[PDB]
Nucleic acid binder design. Structure first.
Ligand code: CA
Ligand code: MG
Ligand code: MG
Ligand code: MG
Length: 326
DNA sequence: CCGACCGCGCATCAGC
DNA sequence: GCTGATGCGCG
DNA sequence: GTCGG
């Protein structure tokens, strides 16, 4: 947190551009600058110093000078004062409400938690669950609780079929002491890039977890991706644990390494890595890495036997998960 | 300058 | 019903 | 908003 004041300001700018301006490229610009600054091992003394980092340009450097000088940013002070902007920023904190819906609700005079509660009829299923657990979803998950959650998911999955393999990814795999949610990567030998030998592979796991009352709500669900809600069991006489977000992704077994690279993140790391891939003449998704032809069209999937193979193709030294928290 | 900025699953809607 | 676009979300 | 060519 050497430069926490600066990274916080940039993150707030990023969110404004995403949520209010709907300017996704500016959102990404601010996030990139925040990330490069967060990893910079010196306390920043000037905008000039910051501008030497990639992703920090003239405008952000000027903002950093203002912030260092006064401890604030006039641009943000004004944004905080603005009713429409503040309302839109708030509503987007509900899962399922993005920039477009938030502005639509604000138009219709729905702009507070109270307003949402009285207008449940205007929400879709995802938004209604997001509102229901608004408080809980803002809380972080102590790694101690992530470990208990891991034990439950891994054991319940084993009970369904011993051939499943469940891997907890995201911030947890990066070694974080707390996580925003739980991300589970699932494989089964019956599901590969070549064939699907059993139907309902994801379904059966989701069903078992609902049966033991671990999964409590569903935000969205398909053949390969589940997004929903879960909760640890609590003991006699004790307060219940908060409800938590859970994501489950079923990946073809022979594409596990690309899948775990993707699902481990961070999100900014993934964007950085994929961009570099392109520069090197490859394209990366959660399934494969493929060479780009002279025309720029993706060729056939390259052989991958480890996460490190992917790094090797794009000529990056291997980075352990704990070093991917960008 | 300026285009180029990752990549994709699921839900919802418009148009047919 | 299907296809395509869009919104939202995952990392 | 940034920056590579
Ligand atoms: Ca996230
Ligand atoms: Mg996560
Ligand atoms: Mg996340
Ligand atoms: Mg997640």
């Amino acid at each position: 947190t050497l430069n926490g004041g600066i990274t916080d300001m940039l993150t707030e700018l990023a969110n404004f551009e995403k949520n209010v301006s709907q300017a996704i490229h500016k959102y990404n610009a601010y996030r990139k600058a925040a990330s490069v600054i967060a990893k910079y091992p010196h306390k920043i003394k000037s905008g000039a110093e910051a501008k030497k980092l990639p992703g920090v340009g003239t405008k952000i450097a000027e903002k950093i000078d203002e912030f260092l000088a006064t401890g604030k940013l006039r641009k943000l002070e004004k944004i905080r004062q603005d009713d429409t902007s503040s309302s839109i920023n708030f509503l987007t904190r509900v899962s399922g409400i993005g920039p477009s819906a938030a502005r639509k609700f604000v138009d219709e005079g729905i702009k507070t938690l109270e307003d949402l509660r009285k207008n449940e009829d205007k929400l879709n299923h995802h938004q209604r669950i997001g509102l229901k657990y608004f408080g809980d979803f803002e809380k972080r998950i102590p790694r101690e609780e992530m470990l208990q959650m891991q034990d439950i998911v891994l054991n319940e999955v084993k009970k369904v079929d011993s051939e499943y393999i469940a891997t907890v990814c995201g911030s947890f795999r990066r070694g974080a002491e707390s996580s925003g949610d739980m991300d589970v990567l699932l494989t089964h030998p019956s599901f590969t890039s070549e064939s699907t030998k059993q139907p309902k592979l994801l379904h059966q796991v989701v069903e078992q977890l609902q049966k033991v009352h671990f999964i409590t709500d569903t935000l969205s669900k398909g053949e390969t991706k589940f997004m929903g809600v879960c909760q640890l069991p609590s003991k006699n006489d004790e307060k219940e644990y908060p409800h938590r977000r859970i994501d489950i992704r079923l990946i073809p077994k022979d594409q596990y390494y690309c899948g775990v690279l993707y699902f481990t993140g961070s999100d900014i790391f993934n964007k950085n890595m994929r961009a570099h891939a392109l520069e090197k003449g490859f394209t990366i998704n959660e399934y494969t890495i493929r060479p780009l032809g002279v025309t720029g069209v993706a060729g056939e999937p390259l052989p991958v036997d480890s996460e490190k193979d992917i790094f090797d193709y794009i000529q990056w030294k291997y980075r352990e998960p704990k070093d991917r928290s960008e």
